[PDB]
Amino acid sequence: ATIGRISTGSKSLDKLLGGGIETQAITEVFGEFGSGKTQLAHTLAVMVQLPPEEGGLNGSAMYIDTENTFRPERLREIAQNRGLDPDEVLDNVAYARAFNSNHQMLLVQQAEDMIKELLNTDRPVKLLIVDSLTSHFRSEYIGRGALAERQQKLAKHLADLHRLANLYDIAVFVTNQVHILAHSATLRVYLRKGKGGKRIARLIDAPHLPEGEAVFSITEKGIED
Ligand SMILES: O=C(O)C1Cc2ccccc2C1
Ligand SMILES: [Ca+2]
Ligand code: NA
Ligand code: NA
């Protein structure tokens, strides 16, 4: 099945990504607080709803929040400033708070129910966001021997997410706070602050995409160049 691409709002970042965030893939962004990772998540939750000539997939979004980062009024602002109705856009982002890592796993199973329900409608789910994907796992699995257990549980969670991406042709977008641990996202992107309020993006361990860094801004439209 054809891979779909969701624009980030930034031509620069889209170019680095090969056209946008991909369906049938998990894209992980990681960086410090304020590096742009959560702003990008909010922007994508709007962009996915646009028709494809505007960089979207005529879809809806689901957002799993682990550390209370979701801001409905930020979605509304981004929508309004892109010419969209803020309430309709907000209504197309299904939201759930994950209370702990086990609940987070259950939420992925519930996400599948909604994805199945909407799959063949005029507005299928096309984006699943997990913000700070590792936060509960790092809180709960800690101490002697916790590395193997935590990594096994994360690997399983990520396998579940890969399955949804592949089976239902959706983009999975995950964020993490910031060197020898294994990772299993399809594509990893490091974000950092740069000069002039810009953020800088770099692909990590991706020899299949060309060399470079993207530069973008955080604005009233979410993310843009
Ligand atoms: O069906 C629901 O009400 C909730 C299930 C779920 C799972 C992940 C993200 C959002 C939501 C919404
Ligand atoms: Ca951010
Ligand atoms: Na995949
Ligand atoms: Na709707």
CATH number for 70: 3.40.50.300
Among candidate residues 174, 182, 171, 185, the one with its CA nearest the CA of residue 134: 174
3-state secondary structure of 189: strand
**219 labelled ligand-binding:** no
Among candidate residues 98, 215, 210, 206, the one with its CA nearest the CA of residue 157: 98
Experimental technique used to determine this entry: X-ray
Amino acid at site 89: V
The answer to whether the beta carbons of residues 49 and 181 sit under 8 Å apart is: no
Q: Which helix (H) or strand (E) holds 131?
A: strand 125-131
Supply the DSSP symbol for 210: -
Torsions phi, psi for 185 (to 5 deg): -65, 155
Which numbered atom of ligand 1 lies nearest the CA of 107?
Answer: 7
Which numbered atom of ligand 1 lies nearest the CA of 63?
Answer: 9
* Chain centre to alpha carbon of residue 215: 18
Ligand nearest to the CA of 123: 4
Q: Separation of 90 CA from ligand 4 center, angstroms? A: 9
Range of the domain at 95: 1-225
3-state secondary structure of 31: strand
C-alpha–C-alpha distance, residues 55 and 44, integer Å: 10
Domain count, the chain: 1
Cβ partners under 8 Å of residue 85, min gap 6:
79
The total of other beta-carbon atoms located within 10 Å of residue 205's CB is 9
Among candidate residues 219, 223, 156, the one with its CA nearest the CA of residue 16: 223
Report helix angle 146-168 to 101-118, nearest 10.
10
Q: Which helix (H) or strand (E) holds 190?
A: strand 187-193
Ligand nearest to the CA of 94: 1
Please report where in the chains the tokens 């199973």 appear, as a residue. Answer: 109
Q: Separation of 22 CA from ligand 3 center, angstroms? A: 9
C-alpha–C-alpha distance, residues 111 and 60, integer Å: 12
C-alpha–C-alpha distance, residues 60 and 50, integer Å: 9
Instruction: Determine the residue of 93, 110, 116 to mutate for testing ligand 1's pocket, defined as the one with the most ligand atoms within 8 A of the Cβ atom.
Output: 110
**31 labelled ligand-binding:** yes
Ligand nearest to the CA of 37: 2
Q: What's this structure's resolution in Å?
A: 1.3
CA distances from 101 to 8, 108, 125, 156, 189 (A): 28, 11, 23, 12, 23
Residues framing ligand 1 (Cβ under 6 A): 62, 64, 94-96, 107, 110-111, 114
Instruction: Determine the residue of 107, 130, 133 to mutate for testing ligand 1's pocket, defined as the one with the most ligand atoms within 8 A of the Cβ atom.
Output: 107
**70 labelled ligand-binding:** no
**34 labelled ligand-binding:** yes
The answer to whether the beta carbons of residues 72 and 92 sit under 8 Å apart is: no
CA angle 163-184-148, nearest 5°? 110
C-alpha–C-alpha distance, residues 200 and 216, integer Å: 7
C-alpha–C-alpha distance, residues 30 and 53, integer Å: 28
3-state secondary structure of 215: strand
**134 labelled ligand-binding:** no
